[PDB]
Symmetry: C2
Subunit: 439 residues, 2 copies
């Protein structure tokens, strides 16, 4: 196949993407080994769905797992009556998700399970895929002439030819695996044919962070989770927390081999030690560095100029309410809280008004990083840790290190009941989720 | 007695004002005629209660009326478990109100009935009195040396020696009477002994407005409903809507007689006409001018200098929510609404958080003036009709002319369920009231 493995793409046809996908245990070859994973569409990752604004999506999910499951259309500002976090598809049963892609939308999104208490094992086992919304902006020469690739960043651990089971420590920290893969491949080689690359990045890991850096090169950030920036932003590195997406341009500077790495990063994961009267928690410290892929530049690279502009960010109405959402931890219990409570699907935590804007202050009072996700209503990050964000773009996950406060501008869009939760999915399963009702 | 009639004063003693008051039909002489009014403490107005911050008030109300009644401590930022708008004292029964006067408080307040559906006839019949909170500011020479008087502005209409009954038109407009009285007296004479007067003003009328102007003189506004301004404000006239209070200094300029008048004012009251195929509503137009009292200045008046400052207004925290409350009318039905609903004591309309600040935008979409009152939580009027307020002070009633929006800064104080409503009390009785719960 092509030197660089990427998931199969399924494209809408005549404005309709109609597809039947089964969630199924699937024997496959993974990183040189045979394993049985849980997959959509018989592959890991699942197929990439590629659509345009105003397309109709009609996706019938058949559940061939021994437990119930469902789908979250992560990042899509659609109705929570479609992206329904409370729906359960029993084993053997099917459900059809039908929605129209919003007109003002572009970027890299994804789909994965969201059945409370079962997300972490299902996601860890291989149930996820990407969804790309193509934009008229993709036609500008500076993007059209770039070489485009999707990178799905997901790690895995195998035991007896199956995904390794969750330990108690896994429920506390979120599970990370030793196989650090890109598109399900182990350190693939990307042999660039053009001097400018456009890379869509997705962190579909349960808990692993990717502190991304390309040897000898900066990255040019052009989109965040849910849409384009207003103009490219040069960065030396880019941290992608679980659930986050980004799009970057890479401008290859000279011939040669360059490593794309996940640099050491300490997300506050914890171990246990006994030093002669202990039996107490101790920091794991930073992750060991990982090579994600080998990037070979072409002969005499002459990259395109950067686009001068991307998409102007909408001017939002003045906000009508300010919310405060405090995250805390009980590590030894592996319990996680928002404003002192664990999730209860029958309990509404916030009630807001559609078409108004809110300010959400989300404060991490724990010691671990927590990546905060809100369904249905993309937001603009104003600041985190008291530092103003250096760009305007739509996001739907924001990472908070210990002690940090994020201030978000949240326009409420579709009416209905939805959720917000930590996207270290173990923490969500263990209670770190709440309910927002929009009317 | 003294040329200028004022209600009897009852003062706290040793930090305690303990008093038994009966609500009772009372034969009395009023404006030269014998009438039976409903009174507190056998007088009209009721006795003036005079207290200081941190005093304890223990007021036992005995109901000797043929219908249930209760008290509203209008303007007092105390608990709605004490100032309870839902409490009913049956005929023949008694209830003791006990509270501590807040430490940061000063001004002219009042007490009257608030039993939904029965307020207008009870208030019109004579059930009201003043409460004054004395302040250490009263000791500054510029106030101490002034001649102080209370003016209770209340009109009345009599029929067969009793308060005139409410007509259907009265329920629509709010009832006004032909006897326009000050402290229950008809055009009394105030023979000033000092050149500077300090007048506490109370509009205790059901519906009548007082566009106050003293012949040949400005007024110096020094307090609004619920506290002092930051410094005196010179005005040529001063409109007092139902429920409002103000304190002014008058600086007598020369010897002579000066009329204090209620100048013509059109509050949008309506009549009916038939002009040959009509039978339709027509504006009553402005009120006829009234003389309230005759003010005789002393010989060679040399008024005191004005105080340079009064009380600094508190710096409020930034607000956490914005509310919108739209007033509308169905005149021919005599029904009045807030956000399209009439009052329901079982229904909570707004839920706010104690010790936060809110912005309330109150919009009058009717054609009549509506004076909007909020219990328990005094507010700062920021602007009305798009015009910024020319002073900072605590208010608890704000007048809105047809079409006007008032923007209020509302710190939420005591926890519990309370109400907000139009203080044309007929309109409150006919539905223009809502419920705020603070937790
Ligand atoms: Cu997700
Ligand atoms: Cu978390
Ligand atoms: Cu979710
Ligand atoms: Cu009142
Ligand atoms: Cu009214
Ligand atoms: Cu009231
Ligand atoms: O999610
Ligand atoms: O009231």
């Amino acid at each position: 196949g092509p030197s660089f493995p990427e998931p199969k793409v399924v494209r809408s046809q005549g404005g309709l993407l109609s597809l039947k996908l089964s969630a199924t245990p699937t024997p496959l070859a993974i990183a040189g080994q045979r394993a049985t994973l849980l997959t959509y569409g018989g592959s890991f990752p699942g197929p990439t769905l590629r659509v345009r604004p105003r397309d109709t999506v009609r996706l019938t999910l058949e559940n061939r797992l021994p437990e119930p499951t469902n789908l979250h259309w992560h990042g899509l500002p659609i109705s929570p009556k479609v992206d329904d976090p409370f729906l359960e598809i029993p084993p053997g049963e099917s459900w059809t998700y039908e929605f129209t892609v919003p007109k003002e939308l572009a970027g890299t999104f994804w789909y994965h399970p969201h059945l409370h208490g079962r997300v972490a094992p299902q996601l860890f086992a291989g149930l996820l895929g990407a969804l790309v919304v193509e934009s008229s902006l993709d036609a500008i020469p500076e993007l059209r002439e770039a070489e485009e690739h999707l990178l799905v960043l997901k790690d895995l651990a195998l035991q007896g030819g199956r995904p390794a089971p969750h330990t108690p420590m896994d429920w506390m920290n979120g599970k990370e695996g030793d196989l650090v893969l890109v598109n399900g491949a182990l350190r693939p080689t990307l042999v660039a044919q053009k001097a400018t690359l456009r890379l869509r990045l997705l962190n579909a890991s349960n808990a692993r962070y990717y502190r991304l850096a390309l040897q000898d090169h900066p990255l040019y950030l052009i989109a965040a989770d849910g849409g384009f920036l207003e103009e490219p932003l040069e960065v030396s590195e880019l941290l992608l927390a679980p659930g986050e997406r980004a799009e970057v341009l890479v401008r290859l500077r000279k011939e040669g081999r360059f490593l794309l790495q996940a640099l050491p990063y300490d997300r506050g994961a914890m171990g246990m030690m006994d030093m002669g009267g202990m039996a107490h928690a101790m920091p794991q410290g930073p992750s060991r560095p990982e090579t994600l892929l080998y990037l070979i530049a072409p002969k005499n690279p002459k990259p395109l100029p950067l686009p001068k502009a991307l998409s102007p960010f909408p001017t939002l109405p003045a906000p009508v309410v300010t919310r405060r959402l405090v995250l805390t931890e009980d590590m030894m219990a592996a319990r996680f809280f928002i404003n002192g409570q664990v999730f209860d699907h029958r309990r509404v935590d916030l009630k807001g008004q559609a078409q108004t804007v809110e300010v959400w202050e989300v404060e991490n009072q724990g010691d671990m990083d927590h990546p905060f996700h809100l369904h249905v209503h993309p937001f603009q990050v104003l600041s985190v840790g008291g530092r103003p964000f250096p760009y305007r773009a739509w996001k739907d996950v924001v990472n908070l290190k210990a002690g940090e406060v994020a201030r978000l501008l949240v326009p409420l869009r579709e009416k209905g009941r939805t959720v917000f939760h930590c996207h270290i999915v173990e923490h969500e399963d263990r209670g770190m989720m709440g309910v927002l009702e929009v009317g």
